[PDB]
Amino acid sequence: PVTKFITINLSKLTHKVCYKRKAPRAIKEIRSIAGKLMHTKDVRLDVKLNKFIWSKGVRNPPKRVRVKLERKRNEKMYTIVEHVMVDSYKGLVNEC
Amino acid sequence: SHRKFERPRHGSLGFLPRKRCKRLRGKIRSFPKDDKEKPPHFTAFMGYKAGMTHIVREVDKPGSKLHKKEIVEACTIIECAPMVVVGIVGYRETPKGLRILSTVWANHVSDEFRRRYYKNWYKSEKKAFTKSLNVPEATKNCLLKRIEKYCTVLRAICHTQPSKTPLRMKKAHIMEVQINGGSMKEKLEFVKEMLEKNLPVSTVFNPNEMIDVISVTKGHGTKGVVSRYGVKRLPRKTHRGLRKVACIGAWHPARVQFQIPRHGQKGYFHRTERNKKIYRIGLKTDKNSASTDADITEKKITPMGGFPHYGVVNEDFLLLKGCVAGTKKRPITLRKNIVPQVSRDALAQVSLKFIDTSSKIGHGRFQTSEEKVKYYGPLK
RNA sequence: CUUUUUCGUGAGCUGAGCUGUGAGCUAGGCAAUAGUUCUUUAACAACAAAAAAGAGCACAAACUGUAGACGACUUUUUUGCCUCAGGGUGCUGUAAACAUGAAAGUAAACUUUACGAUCUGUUGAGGCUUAUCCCUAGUGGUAAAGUGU
RNA sequence: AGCGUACCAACAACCGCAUCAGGUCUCCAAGGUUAACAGCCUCUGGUUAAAUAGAAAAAAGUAGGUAAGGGAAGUCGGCAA
RNA sequence: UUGUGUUGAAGCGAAAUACGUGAGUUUUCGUGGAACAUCUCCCUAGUGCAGAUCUUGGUGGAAGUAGCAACUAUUCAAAU
RNA sequence: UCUGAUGGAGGAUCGAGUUGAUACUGACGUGCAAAUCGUUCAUUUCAAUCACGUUUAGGGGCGAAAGACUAAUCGAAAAG
């Protein structure tokens, strides 16, 4: 049961993807990354994070997203992924 | 009936089958012929493709339209960290071919060399070469005496040191380099002396020497016949597509001949290319390895920003005129010429005036980062 | 098999003695029997049980992309790798905001105030830069340990 | 007085053997740009559904783009663009 | 005419130290559950199949293959 | 006679829609489809287009004429 703050570079994850699949691919990669980092199969993305990823349409999701992962106890373990509004991304490294 | 118009066949049948190479490492099919009169010497080396640059050299070809003018030539950089001699293999001739009499090993081998024997080195307890290295010196001398008595071909096992390169790979590439030179006794003494120390490029090759390069070409997966064999595209009106060979054989013989070009694997082929001239053997020690007498700047071979897709050349290197098969990071086997060349190109003493070190990413205008910052001045 | 014995080799012993082994010498008496043959069960190699003596990797997984339709192939799994960040190298071309700043001109008050494409300064700025670019024992992480022998 | 009055009208309710990219008559007709009931975008209304999805992404196919220098030398023919 | 069947008929599956030259005949075991022969002689016919792009029915290899491609596009969370 | 307006004729012009079908001899050709899909093209005040109703029936009809059409059937329909 831990909380982590990480930046995800979505540009290199959606680099090879079609126009019509950029935002869904970004969402899928965010889920996969959170699952791998937290070692949980149950990953729930916040609707606000979905809104942020889709805010610019399907064509271009944000290049980087600052996100907060949280492990919760209620197979048993699962993780919430939440958007973190930041003015800038420079100097923002992984935190635990 | 006969062809209306004759044209030569597409591609060479001498590089068949166009299948993937068995291995990544370039393998010598045959070493240069042994000359007993010459002193014992190594005949091959292994390095890694770092990248390409261009140089300026003054031509000395009388009667040529270039002659006294200075020309630009493309060159390939092969990072050549010193190899390590770790083994000796004796070969004797039989009607069935060359037969190994025995291979003896040095008293110590590096973990880099041992890694090559493991598919999963991280989770193993690394027990290879741990108890065969305590063999008695008497048995070693017995094996060496029998090799001297019965063998006619001597090869030294030597391995690269990828830790000295930016490669992600940790297991060393190991190969046999045939010792060409004097008698069997002299060959054995020559290898025994350096049975455990480093073998730099300079002891194997001299500047302005022609060598052959053995490597594996750049892979491209399966490619169509148009790209793989260079056949002509069919006209735009062709019903089921135009990127193919129209007729793949006459009615008889009632089969498809092996000479017909077809779709298949392209690239990742083993190739042995002859007559690449060494323009410079750049040492790791000196800080002006990329400098010339006409430049007198202080700069090393690595272009500003690094060698794209390779890294920084921090070791011994050699500058090969022209191109070399393979991607960056590809292991490249340098072999001595099978027979020494006496042509003017092979014997020419190259005098290079400038070695380019601008950024190979984009269109670099500066040779050094210091020159870049000097030109731009202070910024935010 | 016993007796009289001669010569060569192995165990242990100290070039050398003893025991055994093979061949031989003198003398003796001691056996074969299945009804006329039905292959003369006779070799070689292996195996099983019971007795006596000596004696680790690979796959998967995650990573990689020098590879690739899928397999396969090149790699790494704690001086490594992934990640983000910093730096380098480049690409584009000077961000947003502010300015009794400019601006072809216009209108509206008793010399100022409003509109204004566009331009200027802060600003070679801002943005992007590996996803198959380069450097960094910089941040955080590096997971269950399943399958075959 | 008697009879009809639900619903579809195709987008799966009709005819094409079907929940078939086909066929099948009529009326209403917003805003911006504009000559325009054109094209493109939008408001009301409707929809986000189509005999499938995920991943990878090579050959080849199909539907398109762009190509230095030359400019029909291609081809039966400037077919296609 | 003279026989077999619930102490198991016809049919069917596998067979047989079986007989025949052969079409076949006859037996055994198993299954089956109600009929069956007659070669003593004869009468009668819609009486014998490998084929006919044969008829009807059933079933294969192809093959877990071709393929499930118009109509720009889906995503997050919750309920059942 | 000449000039400028006005006027609004025409089996006049371009052009969506409609009605068709020139070319790619494109796709498809075990199709979405026993004639479709895409682009391109022809056509739009008239010999114009559409609906319903109604008439003409097989050696007959109907034909701005191709032996065309007459219910996927036409150098003689379909059913018995």
Residue type (1 letter), B190? F
- Residue B96 CA and nucleotide D29 C1' are separated, in Å, by 94
Contacts of residue A35, defined as CB under 8 A and 6 or more positions apart, other chains included, come to A41, A43, A79
Is the C-beta of residue B312 closer than 7 Å to nucleic acid chain C? Answer: yes
CA B80 to chain CA centroid, nearest Å? 10
C-alpha B97/C-alpha B100 separation (Å) is 10
Residue type (1 letter), B374? K
Residue B120 to residues B88, B115, B291, B331, B343: CA-CA distances in angstroms? Answer: 27, 9, 43, 21, 49
To one decimal, the resolution in angstroms is 2.3
Which candidate, B81, B93, B58, places its Cα nearest to that of B292? Answer: B58
Q: Which of residues 1-20 of A touch strand C (CB under 7 A)?
A: 4, 6-9, 11-13, 15-16
Nucleotide nearest B239 (Cα, C1') = F26
- Residue A51 CA and nucleotide E74 C1' are separated, in Å, by 13
CB B262 within 8 A of CB B274: no
Contacts of residue B192, defined as CB under 8 A and 6 or more positions apart, other chains included, come to B88, B144
Nucleotide nearest A24 (Cα, C1') = E75
- Residue B246 CA and nucleotide F27 C1' are separated, in Å, by 22
C-alpha B202/C-alpha B210 separation (Å) is 14
Nucleotide nearest B236 (Cα, C1') = D80
Is the C-beta of residue B242 closer than 7 Å to nucleic acid chain D? Answer: yes
Question: Would you say B183 is a known binding-site residue?
Answer: no
Q: Which residue has the tokens 């009388």?
A: B62
Method: cryo-EM
Phi, psi of A30 (to 5 degrees): -60, -45
Beta strands in B147-249 (DSSP E): 153-159, 174-180, 198-199, 210-216, 222-223
Nucleotide nearest B264 (Cα, C1') = D59
C-alpha B155/C-alpha B8 separation (Å) is 42
Which candidate, B182, B196, B179, places its Cα nearest to that of B91? Answer: B179
Q: Which residue has the tokens 């339209």?
A: B65
Which candidate, B53, B134, B147, places its Cα nearest to that of B100? Answer: B147
C-alpha B238/C-alpha A68 separation (Å) is 57
Which candidate, B305, B239, B313, places its Cα nearest to that of B283? Answer: B313
Q: Which residues pair with B57 in a beta bridge?
A: B71, B352
- Residue B20 CA and nucleotide E8 C1' are separated, in Å, by 75
- Residue A23 CA and nucleotide E71 C1' are separated, in Å, by 23
Is the C-beta of residue A18 closer than 7 Å to nucleic acid chain D? Answer: yes
Residue A23 host element (H or E): helix A22-38
Is the C-beta of residue A28 closer than 7 Å to nucleic acid chain E? Answer: yes
Beta strands in chain B (DSSP E): 41-42, 44-58, 70-79, 83-94, 97-105, 153-159, 174-180, 198-199, 210-216, 222-223, 264-265, 270-282, 317-321, 331-336, 352-355
Nucleotide nearest B368 (Cα, C1') = C89
Q: Which two tokens stand for residue B199?
A: 């073998």
Residue type (1 letter), B353? K
Report, in ranges, which bases of strand F sit under 7 Å from a protein C-beta: 24-27, 29
Query: Within 10 A of B364 (CB to CB), how many other CB atoms are there?
Result: 15
Instruction: Supply the DSSP symbol for B247.
Output: -
Residue B39 to residues B99, B139, B185: CA-CA distances in angstroms? Answer: 24, 28, 12
Q: Are strands A43-45 and B352-355 parallel, antiparallel or unpaired?
A: unpaired
Nucleotide nearest A25 (Cα, C1') = E75
C-alpha B367/C-alpha B298 separation (Å) is 11
C-alpha B209/C-alpha B351 separation (Å) is 13
- Residue B69 CA and nucleotide E16 C1' are separated, in Å, by 107
Is the C-beta of residue B223 closer than 7 Å to nucleic acid chain D? Answer: yes
C-alpha B148/C-alpha B183 separation (Å) is 9
Q: Identify how many contiguous H helices and E strands chain A contains and give both numbers.
A: 2, 4
3-state secondary structure of A4: strand
Q: Is the dihedral of CA B226, B229, B230, B234 positive or negative?
A: negative
DSSP state letters, B331-377 = EEEEEE-SS---SHHHH----EEEE--S-TTTT---SSHHHHHHHH-
Residue B1 to residues A16, A64, B4, B232, B244: CA-CA distances in angstroms? Answer: 51, 67, 9, 21, 22
Report, in ranges, which bases of strand D sit under 7 Å from a protein C-beta: 55, 57-62, 74, 77, 79-80
C-alpha B135/C-alpha B326 separation (Å) is 41
Region for A57 from its dihedrals, namely left if φ exceeds 0, alpha if ψ lies in -120 to 50, beta otherwise: left
CB B278 within 8 A of CB B17: no
Residue type (1 letter), B198? N
C-alpha B264/C-alpha B245 separation (Å) is 13
Q: Which two tokens stand for residue B137?
A: 């010196």
Nucleotide nearest B241 (Cα, C1') = D61
Is the C-beta of residue A96 closer than 7 Å to nucleic acid chain E? Answer: no
Question: Would you say B369 is a known binding-site residue?
Answer: yes
Which candidate, B140, B229, B117, B270, places its Cα nearest to that of B192? Answer: B140
Contacts of residue A6, defined as CB under 8 A and 6 or more positions apart, other chains included, come to A37, A66, A67, A69, A94, A95
